[PDB]
Amino acid sequence: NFARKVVEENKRVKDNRGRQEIVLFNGLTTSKLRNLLELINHVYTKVYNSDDTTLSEDVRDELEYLKVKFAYESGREPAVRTFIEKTYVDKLVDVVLKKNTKKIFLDYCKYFEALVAYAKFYR
């Protein structure tokens, strides 16, 4: 997917005291992103269980909470804020809300999973 270039731009290398850490950002810890990852996990498991071609209203409410958590994480650490700025996750959640379809939400979830997978691979 096109997330390869985004992750490549977002990927940096850190060095300190003879130790070389291959991490994209200083604050890009697996748990800090994993909170929102598991929120999206709950969202898409609910979507899988519902098996409906339209994005559910309750999924929409958990999703609004997901946007709130996105702003929360951006405030928590500048690294997560810069990652979200580079990836423009807000625009993707906005399109997911607007077109209101299961396929679009699945594509966005796959793209976000691709982002995190490329981040892990480049680590």
């Binding site: 909170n35 309750d58 409410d61 958990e62 609004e64 909470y65 709130v68 958590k69 702003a71 929360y72 951006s74 405030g75 928590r76």
Partner: protein, 307 residues
């Protein structure tokens, strides 16, 4: 098979980590009466959209990204407190030793919403206090605890003098009883033997470590405040923040005046920025240690068995 019903009495505040931490956004913190009402996100967002203030909440979060308190936002918007109690999950009491709510570690709870303590924590505590493949000794989880009892207790460090910390651990109010069902076989583990081992280990942990606190003025103040109940006798320290020495197999294995030195070395290894600078062995190793005037100790729990 020997089935025993186990009663846990939380004489002290106990906080088992749930693996997640929330800042002031997820709960409302009344500072005038010092009460924390835990809320969920979707209901808050739904109410905000109903009142047409969700964009205002987003802007407020943008301006106060580091410290966005839901109680202060609600006070600024001056919306009805009836709505506050309508969209909240559940209310809880706040106890501070000094301050706003900044970073709260939530207590472990089941999926439904009720709170409990896992049996794996009990298994680990029992194994680490016995030493000094546990397949026969099977422990289940606990019964749900009434949500109103649960509160947010302060974590206080006593380096020969009490000092509350900004960190908040969502502990359990005193006087609450929880229940367990545990199956053991008479071939491997004996109920009398294991309970005697627990009480003996707590006794030596008291006499070789806590006596040093007792001699220092901070421990004297803690005793005067009633931190240790008169019953303190099977005693456990299940929650986090109780301290490394509580139920330590290394303490038990090595003789006194030598086990303390090894514990000091271990603490230096674990805390390089705090204990690593320290090099001399003090009298007690480690040196670190409610709205009511009665004081309590972190994790203190009383054990009762009924076969």
């Amino acid at each position: 098979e020997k089935v025993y019903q186990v009663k846990l009495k939380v004489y002290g505040p106990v906080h088992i980590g749930s693996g997640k931490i929330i800042r002031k956004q997820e709960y409302i913190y009344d500072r005038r009466k010092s009460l924390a009402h835990i809320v969920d996100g979707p209901n808050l967002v739904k109410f905000l959209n109903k009142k047409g203030k969700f964009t205002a909440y987003l802007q407020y979060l943008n301006t106060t990204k580091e410290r966005a308190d839901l109680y202060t936002f609600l006070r600024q918007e001056q919306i009805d407190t009836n709505d506050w109690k309508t969209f909240v999950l559940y209310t809880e009491r706040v106890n501070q030793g000094k301050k706003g709510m900044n970073d709260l570690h939530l207590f472990v709870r089941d999926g439904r919403g009720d709170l409990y303590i896992p049996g794996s924590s009990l298994k680990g505590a029992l194994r680490t206090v016995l030493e000094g493949a546990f397949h026969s000794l099977s422990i289940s989880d606990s019964l749900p605890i009434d949500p109103k009892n649960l509160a947010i207790y302060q974590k206080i460090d006593i380096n020969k003098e009490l000092k509350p910390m900004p960190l908040y651990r969502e502990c359990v109010n005193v006087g609450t009883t929880v229940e367990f069902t545990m199956k053991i076989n008479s071939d491997d583990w004996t109920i009398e033997k294991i309970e005697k081992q627990i009480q003996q280990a707590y006794l030596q942990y008291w006499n070789k470590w806590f006596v040093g606190m007792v001699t220092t003025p901070g421990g004297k103040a803690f005793i005067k405040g009633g931190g240790l109940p008169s019953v303190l006798p099977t005693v456990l320290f299940l929650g986090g923040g109780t301290g490394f020495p509580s139920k330590t197999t290394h303490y038990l294995q090595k003789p006194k005046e030598q086990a303390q030195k090894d514990i000091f070395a271990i603490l230096q290894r674990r805390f390089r920025n705090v204990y690593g600078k320290m090099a001399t062995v003090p009298k007690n190793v480690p040196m670190v240690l409610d709205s009511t005037n009665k004081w309590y100790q972190q994790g203190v729990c009383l054990l009762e068995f009924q076969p």
